[PDB]
Amino acid sequence: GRMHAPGKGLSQSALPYRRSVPTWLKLTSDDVKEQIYKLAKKGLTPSQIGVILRDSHGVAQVRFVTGNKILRILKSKGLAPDLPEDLYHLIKKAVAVRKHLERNRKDKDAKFRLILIESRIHRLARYYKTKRVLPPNWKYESSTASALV
Amino acid sequence: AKDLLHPSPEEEKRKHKKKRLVQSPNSYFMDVKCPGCYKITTVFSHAQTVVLCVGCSTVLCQPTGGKARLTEGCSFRRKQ
Amino acid sequence: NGEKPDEFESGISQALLELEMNSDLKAQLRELNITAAKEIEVGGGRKAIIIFVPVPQLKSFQKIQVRLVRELEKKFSGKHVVFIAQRRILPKPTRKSRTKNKQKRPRSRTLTAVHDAILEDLVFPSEIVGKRIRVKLDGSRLIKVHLDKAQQNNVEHKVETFSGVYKKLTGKDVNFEFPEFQL
Amino acid sequence: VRMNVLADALKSINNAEKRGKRQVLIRPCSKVIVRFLTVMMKHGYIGEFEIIDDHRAGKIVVNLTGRLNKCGVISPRFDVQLKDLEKWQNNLLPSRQFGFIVLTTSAGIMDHEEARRKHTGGKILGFFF
Amino acid sequence: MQNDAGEFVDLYVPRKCSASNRIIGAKDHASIQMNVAEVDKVTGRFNGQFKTYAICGAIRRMGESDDSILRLAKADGIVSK
Amino acid sequence: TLDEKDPRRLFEGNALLRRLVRIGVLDEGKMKLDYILGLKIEDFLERRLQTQVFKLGLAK
RNA sequence: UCUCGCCCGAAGCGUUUACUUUGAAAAAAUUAGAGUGUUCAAAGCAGGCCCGAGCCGCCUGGAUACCGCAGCUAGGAAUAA
RNA sequence: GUUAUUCCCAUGACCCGCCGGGCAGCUUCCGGGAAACCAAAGUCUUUGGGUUCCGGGGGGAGUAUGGUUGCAAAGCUGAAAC
Ligand SMILES: [Mg+2]
Ligand SMILES: [Mg+2]
Structure with missing residues (x-):
């Protein structure tokens, strides 16, 4: 189905066969x-x-x-934006779940979901380093997340 | 026995969006003709933003899961 | 650039110059230019004329052709006038052609992308809807291709012309079809 | 996920033949999958077919004849050096003059016995009988 | 099956089914030999000839035969135009 | 197991068949490798010494 | 490119393989197999014919094959990188 | 086709649908199964979708002994003689 949750729904969009707009626009x-x-x-x-x-x-x-x-x-x-948007949004909630753990250090359901979101970052770091749009020196530990909201 | 090449256009509306043979989607563009001042607004039916026209400057579509609905006395068609 | 254009094209190339003479194409064809043409029989004795088009200049032959196909038919026989462009069909680099210090290749100059875009060019006033490579019980391939229903009668008689033209250009056995367009 | 899409196709025909149906669909295409059916068409085990042009990657609709008992794929595609096909003749095809094997030779996709007429050979696509 | 001497050794040709093109065996006792009669022209009288249908077992079990008879009568062209 | 135009077949298949003629198991007609397969054990028991002695008399 | 002596050599002198088929390359011995009545057979590389000595004698045999993988060369450009 | 605000105006509440993915069910000779049974435990001697963990007669036994972790209780890895 998907990666980190076993849902196998199929909600996609499809471009039609038809080409550029015929009469209006x-x-x-x-x-x-x-x-x-x-x-x-x-x-x-x-x-x-x-x-x-x-x-x-x-x-x-x-x-x-x-x-x-x-x-x-x-x-x-x-x-x-010079930091791509696949990496932008997943960081944009990875900061928040770490912050939510800082006032709830017993919400371990949220602790497990951090592992999934930290999984998705370091996979997506590996892809963007391969197309060389994200340079090989780049890293991600804790505070790189913070200022890059 | 069964047919694939020539199914019925009754059958294929019923089947899912990307499960038929041509896969062309199920949304449409609707021609919201508000009486505001002058303007005919082309607007996506399965919309996601509050489609606010530029002349009359009020709401023309509600963001709703599925497709938008219209507010008061707005008429439409399809552009084809 | 080493061209001298021949007689039937000279009958063609004078006809465009005769169309920018105080008609609706004056400043238009002052900015519209020439490549080539051919003179091709389809059906026996009835010959379909086609011309060729510079590819960035196709939109000038595209947005303005409906009055323009009327005009050039007035000057030429009232026979079939269909419009396609100048496609450089570049081969793939085989291992023994050379590594000629050439570029990649684009996919607007390659074979699969070339001759599917001429089926676009022939049926201009109607958008194609769907091709079906019906595989006849041999090494032959039919092209059963769907067409629009809006301008259907506009491209009714053209289908008699089209299958003969597209075999001389490409070499493929087509069959344009009129079903409904299905939203 | 979706890998080795020749194995995708040859389960579709197999499940439709043993069900006994008339015509089937195979939702991806390939020049692998076009030429493999072109092997089967030239021998006549299956009828006409027709490829619906999707602008992304099309589908294949095969009019079944009803001959087939088994249409398989050799899964890792073992390479074939010549004088090793009689081994695969004893192994795969049921009798001594039935069935065929589809090979990926240096000059295209060929047939079992057409391969040693070429005397080139090559990697496997599968088997059918 | 004939050899290079063209020899008829092979015993009988088993009735291959109409829809499945599958062989009906000897001990497959759920086979069927259906026979629908010819009618004449304008008179609507019995021609003394007919057309023979043979269906196999797994078609017969799964209900598939009823699609097979009328479509083969359509493949004949004797039930619709 | 080998191909038709295989010269290794053409030298080995013939010379084996000539060996069968020089013994006389076969006929001097049929020179095909399948006619080798049609053989049996009783040809060889005939071509032993005593049975050709039994065919050339004085064997009793 | 005809720098060299309208076609040819040669010369600028190539993104690679993988794979495939040829081509080389190998030690015999052993194995498959040829040939030979060692009396047959396991063997072995033996022998076959004429000349009553008489011609300062003839002829053929002592093959062929598979030799993994790897390296090399020349053909093949499908699939997979 | 009803019914609630006030009645077009929206959504509620049922009613008959078609789509998607979901927990389950009924029946069936698709076939599979040693059988019970199974729409997956099918597409298997007509055997090759991709991929990870594993069993190899019962006993001795997850026992002895090693390492390794645990404050401890114990965990992971794991024989052999007979
Ligand atoms: Mg996973
Ligand atoms: Mg696992």
Whole structure:
């Protein structure tokens, strides 16, 4: 099923077979990019930025309407968070569960879940070191987590 | 015996999203035509943000598990 | 660049210049250019004309072709005029071709990505929906390919043209099909 | 998880033949899996088939003939050097002139006895009879 | 089965099933030889000929035969157009 | 077990068959390796000395 | 590339293997197998024919094979890296 | 198709569904099983999805002895003679 919890549900999304938008969404790639710079200036996730266009502004998958992907669009003129978002969110709760243990040093159900979240970090450190976007000197012990909220 | 290549379009709506042969998803874009000032709003049906239009500046969709529902006197169609 | 364009293309290349003369294509075809063309029989005696397109300039042949296919048919016979582009089909590096100090290869210049994108190009006014490689009981391959129902009668007669054109380009035995589009 | 997807396919046909059905589905494809069925088509143990084009990785729908008793995969794909096939002839195929074995030779996917006409040989894909 | 001398040694051809294409054995006593009659033209009178159906056992047990007869009559083309 | 055009078969298969002719187990016709397989024990008991002595008389 | 003497040599002189088939390379002995009536047989590498001496005598045999893995060369570019 | 706020307006409450994953059930000659029984204990002499732990006649015995941990009670690893 999944990694650290045995659930074998199947909740996925599928792109249809159909290609770029037929009649509406009169919106160029230069016009998509100028909105999408405006969003990540306001400080949102690439997982949130895709949501913002998807509901509000009628936009489909950005791959069709631009020819490219929203992180490659993002890196073109330097708006990187420079610590990727898979590693960002899992740290963003790994700090909190350690903090929750600091006032409950008997909540061992939360202690076991820390092991699963510490498992997921050091696996994902191994992948990002392999694509060399995360350098080989990089580490993660305790306080690296703290200031990097 | 059984058919795979030519099933019935009755059968395949019933089957799950990614379990049919073409796998095209079950959401749609809906044309919320609020009477606010002028604007026709294209908005995803299975939405997640409070879709606030820019002219009238009120709520057009509720975030709900499943699909959004509309607020008061908002009419829609599909763009196809 | 070492070209001298021949007679039927000169009948073609004058026709575009005749279309930017005080019509709806003046500043348009002043920014639209030429590659090549061919003159191909399909069905016996009825010959389908096709032209070729520079690939970054395809969207000028794409967004504007419906009036433009009317115009060039007025100047050429009222026969079938279908539009495709200039695809550089690059082979894979075999071990004994060389390591020629070349680049990777892109997948807009490779064979599987090339000739599936011409099925895109031929049926422009209708989006393709689904191909089915029906494997006949031999070493032959049918391409049964679904088509849209919205502009269906627009690409009704074109299917008589299409199977003959796509065998000379590619070498594949197709069969365009009209079922419904299924949301 | 999903590994050795030729073994995926050859359980689908096996469970549909012993159930006695008419036509089956195999949810991934490969040029491995296209050419392996192309071996079976040229010999005629199974009927026509037809590959539904998904833009990601398609599916295969096989009209069954009903000949097959067993369609298997050799699982690690042992390499085959020649004059070692008579060993696999005694081992796998039931009789002396029935069945075939599918080989991955230097010039493509071939047949059991077509391999020693080529006199090249190669790694295994499986067996059927 | 014939050899290189073309010799008929082989005893009988067992009735291969209609749907399964499976061999009906000798001691498989749940086989069936179904026979549906021909009718004429406009008159609707009995032709003195017919068409023979043979089904095997595991089809017969699992209820599969009832799909097999009418579809083979459709594969004949004698029950629908 | 070997291939048809196998020259190792063509020298070894023939010379074994010629050996069977020089004993006279076979006929001077059938020169195929399956006709070797059709043999038996009683040919060899005939071609022993006393039985060909029993076929050339004076054996009693 | 015709720097060397329209085709040829040669010269710039290649991301690798794995795998596959050829090609080399090996010591015999032993084993499979050829040939030979050692009287047959286990053996062994023996012998076969003419010349009544008489021709300062003829002919063939003492093979073939598998020799793991590894290294080498030349063909094959499917699958797996 | 009812019924609760006030009645369009939303959700409640049942009613007939179809989808997903879930604990279970009924029946079946799919076959498997030494059998009880099993929709997995099936797709197995028609034997090769990937992968970890393990049993090899009963006794002696997780015993003697070693190391190793435990404050201790004991744990892990583990024979042989006969
Ligand atoms: Mg795990
Ligand atoms: Mg385990």
